[PDB]
């Protein structure tokens, strides 16, 4: 009974042609799992091609083939056979039947004993590659990622071998982690993800009520909310963070109403993994651990904005204290640099005080690293280097001393971010330097030094060196340039023509730079620089909460310890919540919410 | 009306950041040149002449530290061009995103 | 809407009536087939339509776009590179670059099979550009 | 798109070779068998592969495929 005849029979779909197969299999002691019947290049079995070729609903050759497998005594059944390639490893026929959207074949395969925890862990099924599909590794994850709620409901609630929601793949991801990983912030994708997420949570409340599905961490240590915060998936992070359920599963909410009087109400938000009191929070991950381009859009969301504004309003005296200490330090730097040359003792005290302040700032910035932090690092490094060369009397200390003086007075613009009006202005300064200035300066220096070499070789004292002709040409861009008809020179008209062409080309280049900045500024969302400034302020408030480098600071927890309801296991659940008041003048059309308190307080 | 709105909004924060830039380079040039730059109050005037268009940059043969003075002047010219360009781009941001009936 | 519907109907009727002959292979007196005349003239809508074309089961051999496999949401599509690839003489790419006097040639470069084929050809030749 | 056309003209001139030494050029794509002709033969065509992701696939009808499983 040949292999190709077996594949042609199971692809055709007639069960009667599979006659005499079991009697042939009995005498030769060969099994359908054996390597003569697999492809060998991939390990593909005849049941897999029976499921790949289906009828209108379901092929009719599967169950007689599985009966023939049961008839002979096979220690390894055919329904649990996996692929063996490096590309497509661990894939089984239950995955194929779930992929083909076919519920009757899934019922049939589980009904004959298929493993519902087989992991499709080959290379095609891995995370970040070219032309792959990462859904998790499990059949329940494949059913949830492809919008098949009937297959999900069967795999959870079948009589024999139920699938576990707590089960997790090689990366430690459950089904909720995998639903975070497939989000792309499109409309249809988000509508799939939030609906399947809530359905899985409610089914876990029904099936396994004692376990918390969202507390389970991955192998990196992340829960679904922190993975959503790290990955930068805004649609599901916003949805999870303000979540309201109904009466039988109301303990799975993260948003509550404390009281409601007319149009005013007070809402409560759960601060479980959000508040920066605890280790490895959502705020620290948005600020410090996410490499997404849109972190500043995630700061602006609804519970986070008011929590950060409250944390900022407490820490304004510490911000003003740090500003005054840095400004006193720079006044001492200036008085020590201006008097370099009763007095010598004051100068010695000034030099030692500048060395201690430089070592202080350098240790603080290195403790940070273990745009603006780079500049504070460079100032501190050059200050310590200048004072170490001042101790040895190397006499080349004075350029480094005055260079670090200029950088310290410029680094004073870090503190402009305390106000909105100056903070957005300095955000724009950084964006003008790091984007628009450098390619201007590239094309300009290529234009400058070509004309410089041309004028030196043509004038051979107007232009003696390359380095002096480039200075005389730069004076044109300032406004101090000297163009005259040179009577002394042999080649007078050509020098005059080269100067006139230089002036025209640099006017064209400056005009292009200005027009490119208008192209960037007219085509822009106005909220974006505001939100970049908000993220600057959030990073500042988290570093001020962490404390200084020598003295760690004991930090208070935010919120209020408030009793929300009862757990399914007969206890009250007290949660730390953040209060946000609201006004709504269209309340009276909508239905009234359930409240914790009868009257305001 | 536009003259008042340009003075009371756009000019003062430009002038804040500009004076912080001006006097840092002034102190640096006086302490490095120790007669090109004798006092703080005269070096700040010589640096303000660059913003007008009358600034004098030359390779100072007399000074001990010649290349560093030249590099500090070139960096000053670049930073003030960046600041003026930012002021202009912020006024275009305020003027393109506005209702025309409001000044009326 | 007239041109693409009448074009497909004429192709299917040629499949029914004279199946051995290829209607789109016949050249003009300049040496251009319909796709190259569309590329030269700068007619974007019909050039885009011809370049990614899918028919149904009785005339499926007249397509220029195919599906190799499909698994859930991911799929791999196939595009015919008959007169497009610059390996052969007088291609669509050489005509858009060198023989068309249309003002909007740069809009025809951005279309869906052409953009990725040009990005692949650029990614191979970066060492020669740096050399 | 004007920059893209500049890049396309550059890549075609670099494929043509230098002026003294013409360059033997490779054909792009993959020689893949698509179906059968009306005159009882298979038609092999050179094709270019482009991958796609679509999260609204399940409302639409399924396409006809060349391969049963990915590769
Ligand atoms: C890291 C970069 C890109 C940088 C390092 C130094 C060399 C710098 O020259 C530049 C570019 C440059 C290159 C050559 C000639 C002139 C300018 O700009 C900054 C850099 C640009 C200036 C302007 O400073 C700012 O950007 C404003 C600012 C400072 C500190 C902040 O913490 C800050 O946060 C908002 C903003 C400061 C200098 O350190 C300075 O005062 C001196 C003497 C030169 C400046 O290079």
Residue numbers in the entry:
A (entry chain A): 73 to 413, 427 to 455, 469 to 558, 586 to 726
B (entry chain D): 525 to 558, 586 to 655
C (entry chain B): 263 to 393
D (entry chain B): 656 to 726
Show the paper's wording.
TRPV1-TRPV4 are non-selective cation channels which play important physiological roles in sensing noxious heat, maintaining cardiac structure and maintaining skin, hair and bone physiology. A distinctive feature of TRPV1 and TRPV2 is their permeability to large organic cations, such as the cationic dye YO-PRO-1 and the sodium channel blocker QX-314. The non-conducting structures of TRPV1 and TRPV2 possess two restrictions, one at the selectivity filter (SF) and second one at the intracellular mouth of the pore (termed the common gate).
Classification of the TRPV2RTx-APOL sample revealed the presence of four classes: one low-resolution (~7 Å) class, which was excluded from further analysis, and three higher resolution classes which are representative of three different conformations. These include one C4 symmetric and two distinct C2 symmetric classes refined to 2.9 Å, 3.3 Å and 4.2 Å, respectively. Unexpectedly, the transmembrane domains (TM) of the three structures obtained from amphipol-reconstituted TRPV2, TRPV2RTx-APOL 1-3, show similarity to our previously solved cryo-EM structure of TRPV2 in its apo form (TRPV2APO) and adopt non-conducting conformations. While fully bound to RTx, the TM domains of TRPV2RTx-APOL 1 and TRPV2RTx-APOL 2 structures largely retain C4 symmetry. Nevertheless, the RTx-induced conformational changes in the S4-S5 linker are not efficiently propagated to the TM in the TRPV2RTx-APOL structures, and they fail to open either of the two restrictions in the pore.
